[PDB]
């Protein structure tokens, strides 16, 4: 899916961990 934009070698090597998902109570209550 992401291969459309990123090289094959990049999808393979170790990547930095995603930043912590920080959500606001507004979005949490508004969506679900």
């Amino acid at each position: 899916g992401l291969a459309k934009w990123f090289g094959s070698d990049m999808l393979q090597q170790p990547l930095p961990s995603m930043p912590a998902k920080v959500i606001s109570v507004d979005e949490l209550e508004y969506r679900q």
């Binding site: 912590a20 959500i23 109570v25």
Partner: protein
């Protein structure tokens, strides 16, 4: 009285109750960060839009002071 790292029970103005660890506070924007938070829903608080407990555990949830109906330590 609450402190950093204490277990907080927090009821929003939508009558939804949250349990999480008090991570920190931002006095400038009047916001509150809880960690490892779970939504308990509306429980026994009357409302025409009831919410049941959700299983999911949230990494961080940010509340404004104006979102808070009530806040107590556990």
């Amino acid at each position: 009285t609450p402190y950093i790292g204490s277990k907080i029970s927090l009821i929003s103005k939508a009558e939804i109750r949250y349990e999480g660890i008090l991570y920190t506070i931002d006095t400038e924007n009047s916001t509150v960060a809880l960690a490892k938070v779970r939504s308990f829903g509306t429980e026994d608080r009357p409302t025409d839009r009831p919410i049941p407990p959700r299983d999911e555990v949230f990494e961080y949830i940010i509340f404004r002071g104006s979102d808070i109906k009530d806040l107590t330590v556990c």
